[PDB]
């Protein structure tokens, strides 16, 4: 009622371990959520084109070109790690369990307060704060997932990752087709590539509106409103790294000569001629066997074609990978493609007293062993006449098209029948938790952005808007624009999302890597004399696992 | 291709796609391996190229076998040494059972 | 029916190359001992196997 | 799998045999460029050494119950039954220019 | 790295860790193990799956 | 029987997650146990005097002069955490559990082996091993406790810690009375002191013997041997420190003014004179309330004297100390009283390929702040008038007694009714697990060398002996040395070790301090090229808990 | 645990005593004394006092 509170704080996340090395994880997240009336209450069909930028050559990958339906609602999104765990928790889970299952969600609104901005236009122009009693807010819940799905973790855009500071929801828009041609081109390419924004293919339009889909809720300050709880589908995520690569699977060869003294140099020596040993190759016309050469079960990680734009129907677009490299090779400096890059602000993560705008970033190598050096890939002419011949071999060091900083491998795709790879890991806490399959007849294999896809079923969107706050003067046939009572509300946001976790057991003489704070890390978990807050960016599959 | 005169596009080419179909690996005999454990892997192989059966939920364990120590009257653990045994070998029978 | 992969096509990972392994080779009309291919295994041993 | 080394068991009923010396694979990192014959200069050929979260070593006393058996001993595995579609032996000589 | 140390040689690679242990591996699964070149005969010419 | 084994190896540690956050960890530990036939057949009662070495004034505290009674049984002893847990599992324990129970303890005899050395002299003079099937292995297990307790890890002589290397028991002992006197001198102390070993008080005599006391087990090859299950009583072990000293206990001071930049020198402060602030203190003659002097419910640790040596009717003894020091002010370098200091050698974590007899060390630095600074302390005359005056004022710079290496922190104690303080933490590998009580009427409040006392009931020591192999010579009433065939005896030896441990808890928003393997130290925890192996000591209580 | 002598009397005499057969900053055991490898019968750890 108007005096009355309807529901309750609850940012706990309970750990409860069930028989058998199981535990429910339950997830509690609150959030104070501040809404303003839209610049418009119409569905707006806009164009971007930065045709402008494009036009330079040599530029193509600068793209922005695209059509978008603009609508009067703002969308509530909590599907962000970041939004459920803190540093601490994500400790617990990624240091002691060894599989997530994501299980349930479920979210409500409650508390819900709309106030209306009276300006005094005074000396010192003044501005009163007052509560519209009567006024509503709006709220609807895509649970039939209508409406296209649209992920606000991609753009850095989810509910903000602390309890004690008040977050606001994105403004909803959608994709709307259209239909553009684009032809690559290079500094110094003479001309002026077709550079084209054709328009809308008829048959591909689709002009949604929630008020015609959903069923629409209006709260008032005594209301609340909660969905109820929502069960996904998804295979288990795994919290362990694989390390072995087709170089380290099954066994090994014998050494007939070991190492008598201890020293970095003595080396064990198998003790048989290249060309003399047993075993088993895929080398038809060659007595050799090696570890390059001797036989394995499958292959991998695969090698995918890198900086690769491919383009369709609306533009160009990159060619994703589903893992990229780094280790022994690769760190910020042996830098490549398959790593994700995540940028954002000061409500997810960028510290929170910089000044500056300019986005806080970071590049993901993750510690799963999947990837590739192409730097070590050669394809090598069949007869094999070994110390090969420049003719008989193509390194990643010749160049392709005559170009000089091209070489096979960035065209180079070994995906096949025999390729072995794991999903994405979780990516803690700017990386999106689920994500929907798309309604495809053949589907992907995996997504690089969310550990979990839900197929057959995924928790709808949840929408919120201030609802139109007229004034005196209104007319309907007027073919200016409405006036409204200058209105914003408050509410609080409540979710629950429930996991189920496996413990970890050693299995290995030797200890485990584990999450751990330290000298040099410690000042990322504490608050500044100002109280200047920041989530440093943590890894998830931390232990190793035999792949084989 | 890359100019080079020993290679061609046929040794970077690949036509996988959704339409190819294939077998799995035929038995040789009698080199070859019979099983083949699957790799925990999110997303598995379609074959192995060394065993025209791979099992996935279960495989039979790896039998290990050695002689325990055969000490002398001699034995000092805090020695660096090397640990003196009595020559010590074992033969014994093995008997396997496979079902088809 | 089948398909064309690279060959004699090294990749390299975390620990060394390794030659990228074909589900089936070739043989028959072309392929014998002379044709040799990519994709065919190849068996050495011993007196106790053979 | 002891067979990708030709190191199973002997394949005739009348000749004794032996069991193999079991070791099995430990992380390093290792780094070669290829090149050709004639290639100017000497690539980088390197043996890094292990990702410490790449560590995993294994010993049987820790890890499986062991048995001693002396002769009046005997020991025996159950039975393990396996998971694996049918292997067919029979072979396809279809191609595309043959379908239909 | 000596035999790797001549250009053109890479696919010669066998740089490798390993763990060695006391023990010895019982393996039994080669198809020579269990069937003579009479038992196959017959599974070859008359059966049509395994 | 002859050929038939009687028992089976295992030294799998298996962790079973119970209800309710409560794992059930059993340790199982095999070993292969080699014994040799003792050097006499006798009870000898020996006396040690280094009169010699303690003849140079200022040697006092290089005293080993003792009495012990020799005996020919062989101690078999596994209370030493490195027999039971591998550097990996005790990652598991300490980085997730948060108390740990020591519940029972099992051990067994089987597959016993007697074989008798026959020496060929011949030209290169050689030796035939073989069995003798109807000898027997003599074991003895206490239960009743009537031997005197004799913790062989004191002595770094356990069972080894490695599944894979044979050990060996240890050969009993035990003290016997005696009575010494040595006074304390000085470099250049003129005289010689009295330094007399009196001898021994007949009312304070015990002469023990196993044969009398023990029930004896002969086993054959054939027989086996098990104790059964003991169950201990002992109070929980906590898997976590304590951080907080008096200077953090409770509400701290309210802030008037609170830094409005972000800087290491910016400073908050509390806004009020020292004289004229609210709050309690116990200088009922001062108005000055400061951090220093604000009143504290109770003291968490307290002073002993250090680098003190009592004396009783047997000699001068170091006077034991709860906790020592370590962190802001001591490293290795500010090396303090209280830390323990462990030598062993190769079965018990020294490196296994090393050569050369120098005992492995290390001095532990637990993790928990309840100990001093002596240099930060300071006595102060009543009247308080501050900048205190040279002769108000007791310095841990001012000697005392005239010497100037000597302050009073030496010989103070504050130790009293509102004392505080916790248990001695687990020592891995090399520490103790349990100790026996002392029969006592009053008993200490810890033990500085286990965390686990069993107070009422401990598991009794296990004794193990050839029996003597006569040969077809053997005169009883001969003045001489019994002959005896030589024969050693080699068995398996079965222990299981359960404890009941409680799984932690997240409840902070920053992570915790967990144990993990890292490029510095990876390379402890694998074998050598040589199969060189080392067992680096660990910490055990790395989280905080809140103490008040 | 009395520490273990390498040396026992070998005829019988109040003088005929056993020696440990250790240096004094070589054995092995435990003491309380961090900055010290002299490991005595002074010097080594007790449960309490």
Known sequence: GVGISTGTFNNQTEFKFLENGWVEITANSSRLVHLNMPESENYRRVV????????????????????????????????AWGVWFNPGDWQLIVNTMSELHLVSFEQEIFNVVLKTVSESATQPPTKVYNNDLTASLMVAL?????????????????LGFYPWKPTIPTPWRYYFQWDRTLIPSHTGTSGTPTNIYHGT???????????????????????????????????????????????????????????????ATNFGDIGVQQDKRRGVTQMGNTNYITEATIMRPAEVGYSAPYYSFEASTQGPFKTPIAAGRGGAQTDENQAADGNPRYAFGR??????????????????????????????????????????????????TDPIGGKTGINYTNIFNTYGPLTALNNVPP???????????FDTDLKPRLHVNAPFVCQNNCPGQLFVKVAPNLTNEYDPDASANMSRIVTYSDFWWKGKLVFKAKLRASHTWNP?????????????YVPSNIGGMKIVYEKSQLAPRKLY
């Open 427 to 437: 990516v803690y806490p700017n990386g999106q938790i689920w994500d929907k399959e």
């Open 347 to 396: 409500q997810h993560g960028q510290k929170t007293t910089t000044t500056g705008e300019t986005p806080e970033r970071f590049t993901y190598i993750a510690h799963q062993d999947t990837g590739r050096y192409p730097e070590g890939d050669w394809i090598q002419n069949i007869n094999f006449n070994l110390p090969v011949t420049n003719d008989n071999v193509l390194l990643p």
């Open 512 to 524: 485990i890597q584990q999450m751990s704070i330290n000298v040099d890390n410690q000042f990322n």
């Open 201 to 263: 293919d008829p048959d591909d339009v689709q002009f949604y509106t929630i008020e015609n889909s959903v069923p629409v809720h209006l709260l008032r300050t005594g209301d609340e409103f909660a969905t109820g709880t929502f069960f996904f589908d998804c295979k288990p995520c795994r919290l362990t790294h694989t390390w072995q690569t087709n170089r380290a699977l099954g066994l090994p060869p014998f050494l007939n000569s070991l190492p008598q003294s201890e020293g």
């Open 48 to 79: 971007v084109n930065n045709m402008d930028k494009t036009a330079v050559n040599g530029n193509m990958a600068l793209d922005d070109i695209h059509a978008q339906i603009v609508t009067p609602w703002s969308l509530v999104d909590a599907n």
């Open 142 to 158: 895509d649970s039939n997932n209508t409406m296209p799905f649209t992920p606000a973790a991609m753009r850095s855009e989810t």
